[PDB]
């Protein structure tokens, strides 16, 4: 009943307060930050620019890359007054963008679900990654991972007829043979930062304050490089998620 | 603050010593010799010179061999004033070498990571070996292993239409069939020596002191011979590694 | 009990129509030193821990629902108006602090209207798109004129194109989820807020990040009968809660 | 000796929601300490109880955080919210924003009203909740027969009205997926006219917010029909 | 009876960093005894604390294990190291050599200076550490406003200067992978001129070494961009 919104808050009632009624509440857990975000969701896909026997090289094709950034937020070959520089590794973008004329598909990669619904300012967690084959041919593929901020080491094949990506002390994966088609695994919160920005970082990324405003540095879970004969759908999963400082969700269009 | 380098050493300080400050140290284990080297890395690859049904024979092809030496250090068909003798089993070399005109690939096989970063004079450990298929065809392959110093027994097929390599009491492996594509296993520190030279052995390998200076004898983990229809990438992994007597790491080029 | 006073060093706010002090995230900046810095921090500077009272804006009948002004921190107090606090801030790499604020605005029993006064972490303060670089303009400066709401709050892109949305999007329909209070002409002439220290890191490289923003937004338009005092200002008393400074050096030339 | 195993028909299968973990490839990695942080929360449900704004449509059909009243008793209702998470005037409230990610709900909805007209203004309103079965009310008189409360203006600026959870089923679907369209209506009427003195703005604005009440819960996490902000 | 098993989607997959062991093919093999050995160590981190040489560039641009000073007070700084593992004058120190195999660091860097000029020579230096935010110092006067220490020549030959770990984040990236380029600078200045008597070499050389301080740590083992020695 009667109250005062001015003070920053109000009585949070149930039927029994103003009327001859009562609390109808039942136990229920499924609405918890952790449990809720703890399910798999696609953010993009990987397409090999080259064989399992050669030297790897950044490669784009119809918005598809042979390498991808592990973050919920939007990403893509770095943008430029003259167009996204496709000869390079993807980076975090500040907005979502149509692949072409019509809205879909998207040029950018990201967790659309998480974007349309991230009721919070900061978050953190571990990331469980799943890489599933889109094709039906006996697979021969190599996958390389690296933590946020690490050298891409996108150098030349040392050993002929073998995959350059496999040539590293970093965590790499080798998948090959009939029936062997999906890669699954989990990586640690590997960022230099204490917590990550769910949406926006109200500051410059460089000391000169001239560049990339709104994007926090190393605000991601590292990245993936692929090589071999198979393209794959890539999904992420929020492990032991934690969120802070509540904020507004993505706007929804009012009915005409 | 004030000290004297002459005596062979100096105070190893933190901020709190010279100033109104303090120790900012956090717990952390990932910098340990054992843990650090305890990850897989490619040293070369194996290419079959012949069927699963025939008599095995040393064979080279575009720097690829049907046999390989288990050591981090550089190796290859034995060198000669007239060129590496390719009709023979690989041996330890004293330097790394380009396959051809440009730097890469390499003619020699080795753990490039371990070479660019082995801050120690001697080491020891067990070796975990992984042999992964580079191709997609139903595999039919045989792999033979032997400890450092053992007879190659690279003799003739006793039983017709079968693999000569399989004809031994030594540890051998038989892989065949759709989906069956990788071989994994671990071998013991099998050297006659107490510890191994991480880089250099400042002495002659023969009593006559005329030959192979800088290379310690039986300073390896044995070797692999292959036969059958499939080529494979070969990686090694340092198990329960131990290092001794610290020394300088591979030089890094000063910026022009 | 609607009459209250708050003192801070040689400064003191005072009000006869308060509705209490809303304390965000249910807690305050305690002035702890950052575990990420080795050097003993500079803190507890009385001269720097007070209310800096300044002008916010002129509220008129013209402004509509959700029109607003954004005030960035610490930035807005990093220069001259910040006195000793700004002066000390300019000479340190890092600063970590909370904020205690009082927003003031009076009218009369014959006036109508209401404001949403609140504080948000990582809230977009960019003014416009810088022609050439594909970046914002004056992120760290306070709005000098009311800002019109977006019919469809999809944010601001710098690539000069339109479509979908930007990460700097802010959906006003939900602004009340942020720590706030409502300034209602018929009820009160002041609002009192307070926030802790939050951020992507243990302490802040302030020079390049406005981690907190003080936002004043209109809910129901200002209204008054002819003859009624037409001139209505909105001012504010801002105070740094337990500022803690690290990484002393030559002075950053905000100027 | 090896353990004999029976390999189930569903092998090699991947489950987006599999109740189990997978292989760790970068172990012993410390998670950058964040003990300094405040503002943390665990349950999406809480966000639901924070009152946020209802979008009220204008003739030229554009939205306001409120509605208006004056020195009259409009024969019809001032505003009318349809108790239904899917419902549109809520399209943009935290309550609805969270709710669209879940299949079912239970409990009370709380409608919050804030009077922003001048201090010198007075008057009374009649807020009501009408359950289905007899159709939606077309007159204060009818509304008055269902669940209702009288809201009196005065010193205290606001009013919290609770739409009771009255239903056949223990739960209710959160979305207009096919058509039973609703779970009743919340209607606001003038009981007495807004009254006041000369020199006072004749048209007062009442802020309209909505939120999940105390009893309230959501369940079964799902995906909404995908959308694109305008 | 056989145990029924659910075969996970990720089968047949190989993990370079898999936290587990594999099959043993030559068991019961004794490891050649090495109990006689000395010089053993367990933590790469220790190598990090052993001070090694900084590579100082000459006009014709070639490197020296040191820098020179004389009977003058150069208006500008004598040398300046950029606190940044990736940084080049350290390119070849054990500290950097180890650090490039790890993704992040924390703690103090210790800069060691050794005076090798003649016993008869005197003088004082001003070593300083400047954190970012206001740009790198361009004058002793400015430097003097940041963290600093005065180094006085005398009987004792050397000096250990600690660049404090002052930072927003609990950790810092070890590599110049994209561009925030640095974490401040270490600058060396003359406070007073090197003074001395006739018959003494007028230009003294100061050995410059660097090492990880006590507080210091590294984490997340990785691979550097591959290289080839000149």
């Amino acid at each position: 009943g009667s109250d005062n919104a001015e003070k920053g808050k109000v009585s949070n009632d149930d039927a029994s307060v103003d009327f001859v009624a009562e609390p109808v509440k039942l136990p229920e857990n499924q609405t918890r930050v952790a449990f809720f975000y703890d399910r798999a969701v696609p953010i993009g896909m990987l397409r090999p620019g080259q064989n399992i026997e050669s030297t790897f090289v950044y490669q784009e094709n119809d918005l598809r890359l042979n390498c991808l950034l592990l973050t919920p937020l939007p990403s893509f070959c770095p943008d430029s007054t003259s167009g996204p520089v496709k000869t390079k590794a993807p980076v975090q973008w500040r907005w979502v963008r149509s692949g072409g004329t019509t809205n879909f598909p998207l040029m950018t990669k990201q967790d659309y679900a998480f974007l349309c619904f991230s009721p919070f300012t900061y978050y953190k967690c571990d990331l469980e990654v799943t890489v599933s084959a889109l094709g039906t041919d006996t697979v021969a593929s190599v996958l390389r991972w690296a933590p946020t901020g690490a050298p891409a080491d996108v150098t030349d094949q040392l050993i002929g007829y073998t995959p350059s990506l496999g040539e590293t002390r970093n965590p790499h994966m080798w998948l090959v043979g009939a029936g062997n088609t999906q890669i699954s695994f989990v990586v640690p919160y590997n960022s230099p930062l204490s917590v990550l920005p769910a949406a926006w970082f109200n500051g410059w990324s460089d000391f000169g304050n001239t560049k990339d405003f709104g994007v926090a540095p190393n605000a991601d879970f590292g990245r993936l490089w692929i090589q071999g004969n198979t393209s794959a759908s890539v999904r992420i999963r929020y492990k032991k998620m934690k969120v802070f400082c509540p904020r507004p969700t993505l706007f929804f269009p009012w009915p005409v | 603050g004030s000290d004297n380098a002459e005596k062979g050493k100096v105070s190893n300080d933190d901020a709190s010593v010279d100033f109104v400050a303090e120790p900012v140290k956090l717990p952390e284990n990932q910098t340990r010799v054992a843990f650090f080297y305890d990850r897989a890395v490619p040293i070369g690859m194996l290419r079959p010179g012949q069927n699963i049904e025939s008599t095995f024979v040393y064979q080279e092809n575009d720097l690829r061999l049907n046999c390989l030496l288990l050591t981090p250090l550089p190796s290859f068909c034995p060198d000669s004033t007239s060129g590496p003798v390719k009709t023979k089993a690989p041996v330890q070399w004293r330097w790394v070498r380009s396959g051809g005109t440009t730097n890469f690939p390499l003619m020699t096989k080795q753990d490039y990571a371990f070479l660019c970063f082995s801050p120690f004079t001697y080491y020891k450990c067990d070796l975990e070996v992984t042999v992964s298929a580079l191709g997609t065809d139903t595999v039919a392959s045989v792999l033979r292993w032997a400890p450092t110093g053992a007879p190659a027994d690279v003799t003739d097929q006793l039983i017709g239409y079968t693999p000569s390599l399989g004809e031994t009491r030594n540890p051998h492996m038989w892989l065949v069939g759709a989906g069956n594509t990788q071989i994994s296993f671990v071998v013991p520190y099998n050297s006659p020596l107490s510890v191994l030279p991480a880089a250099w052995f400042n002495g002659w390998s023969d009593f006559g002191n005329t030959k192979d200076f800088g290379v310690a004898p039986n300073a390896d983990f044995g070797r692999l011979w292959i036969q059958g229809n499939t080529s494979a990438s070969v990686r090694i992994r340092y198990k329960k590694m131990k290092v001794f007597c610290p020394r300088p790491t591979l030089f890094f080029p000063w910026p022009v | 009990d609607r009459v209250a006073s708050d003192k801070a060093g040689n400064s003191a706010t005072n009000t006869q129509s308060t509705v209490g002090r809303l304390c965000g995230y249910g807690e305050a900046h305690h002035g702890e030193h950052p575990a990420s810095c080795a050097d003993t921090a500079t803190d507890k500077v009385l001269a720097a821990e007070r209310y800096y009272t300044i002008d916010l804006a002129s509220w008129t009948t013209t402004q509509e629902a959700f029109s607003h002004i954004r005030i960035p921190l610490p930035h807005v107090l990093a220069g001259e108006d910040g006195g000793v606090f700004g002066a000390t801030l300019r000479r340190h790499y890092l600063c970590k602090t909370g904020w205690r604020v009082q927003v003031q605005c009076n009218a009369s029993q014959f006036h109508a209207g209401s404001l949403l006064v609140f504080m948000a972490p990582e809230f977009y303060t960019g003014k416009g798109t810088k022609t050439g670089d594909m970046e914002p303009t004056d992120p760290f400066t306070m709005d000098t004129t009311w800002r019109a709401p977006q019919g469809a709050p999809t944010g601001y892109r710098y690539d000069s194109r339109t479509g979908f949305f930007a990460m700097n999007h802010q959906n006003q329909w939900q602004w009340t989820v942020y720590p706030h209070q409502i300034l209602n002409l018929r009820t009160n002439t002041t609002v009192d807020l307070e926030v802790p220290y939050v951020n992507i890191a243990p302490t802040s490289s302030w020079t390049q990040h406005a981690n907190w923003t003080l936002v004043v937004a209109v809910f129901s338009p200002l209204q008054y009968a002819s003859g009624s005092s037409s001139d209505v200002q909105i001012t504010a008393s801002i105070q740094p809660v337990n500022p803690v400074f690290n990484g002393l050096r030559h002075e950053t030339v905000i100027a | 000796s090896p353990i004999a195993v029976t390999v189930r028909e569903h092998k090699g299968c991947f489950y987006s929601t599999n109740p189990d973990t997978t292989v760790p490839i970068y172990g012993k990695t410390i998670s950058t300490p964040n003990d300094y942080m405040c503002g943390e929360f665990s349950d999406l449900l809480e966000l639901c109880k924070l009152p946020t704004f209802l979008g009220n449509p204008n003739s030229n059909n554009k939205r306001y955080p409120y509605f208006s009243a004056t020195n009259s008793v409009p024969t019809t209702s001032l505003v009318d919210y349809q108790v239904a998470l899917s419902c549109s005037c809520m399209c943009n409230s935290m309550l609805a924003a969270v709710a669209r990610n879940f299949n079912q709900y239970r409990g009370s909805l709380n409608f919050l009203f804030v009077f922003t007209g001048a201090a010198m203004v007075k008057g009374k309103f009649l807020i009501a909740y009408t359950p289905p079965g007899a159709g939606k009310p077309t007159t204060r008189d009818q509304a008055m027969q269902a669940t209702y409360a009288i809201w009196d203006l005065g010193l205290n600026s606001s009013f919290v009205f609770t739409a009771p959870f009255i239903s056949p089923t223990h739960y209710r679907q959160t979305s207009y997926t096919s058509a039973a369209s609703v779970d009743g209506w919340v209607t606001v009427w003038q009981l007495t006219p807004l009254t006041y003195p000369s020199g006072t703005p004749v048209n007062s604005d009442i802020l309209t917010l909505v939120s999940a009440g105390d009893d309230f819960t959501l369940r079964m996490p799902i995906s909404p029909t995908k959308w694109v902000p305008q | 009876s056989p145990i029924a098993v659910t075969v996970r989607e990720h089968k047949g997959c190989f993990y370079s960093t898999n936290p587990d062991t594999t099959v043993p093919i030559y068991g019961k093999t004794i490891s050649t005894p090495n109990d006689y050995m000395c010089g053993e160590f367990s933590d790469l981190l220790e190598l990090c604390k052993l001070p090694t040489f900084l590579g100082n560039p000459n006009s014709n641009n070639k490197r020296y294990p040191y820098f020179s000073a004389t009977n003058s007070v150069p208006t500008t700084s004598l040398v300046d190291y950029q606190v940044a593992l990736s940084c080049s004058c350290m390119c070849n120190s054990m500290l950097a050599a180890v650090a490039r195999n790890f993704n992040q660091y924390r703690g103090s860097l210790n800069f060691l200076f050794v005076f090798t000029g003649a016993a008869m020579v005197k003088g004082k230096f001003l070593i300083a550490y400047t954190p970012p935010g206001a740009g790198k110092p361009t004058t002793r006067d400015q430097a003097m406003q940041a963290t600093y220490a005065i180094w006085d020549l005398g009987l004792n030959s050397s000096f250990v200067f600690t660049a404090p770990f002052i930072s927003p984040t609990h950790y810092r990236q070890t590599s110049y992978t994209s561009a925030a380029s640095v974490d401040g600078w270490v600058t060396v200045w003359q406070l007073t001129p090197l003074t001395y008597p006739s018959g003494t070499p007028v230009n003294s050389d100061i050995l410059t070494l660097v090492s990880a301080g006590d507080d210091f740590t590294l984490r997340m083992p990785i691979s550097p961009t591959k290289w080839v020695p000149q």
Partner: peptide
């Protein structure tokens, strides 16, 4: 707390399966 419902849920040690939580202060 999260979406995990398996009893035999250890196999890989805790410290390997998850980032290690540690408090700066």
């Amino acid at each position: 707390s999260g979406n995990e419902g398996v009893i035999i849920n250890n196999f890989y040690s805790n410290q390997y399966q998850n980032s290690i939580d540690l408090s700066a202060s």
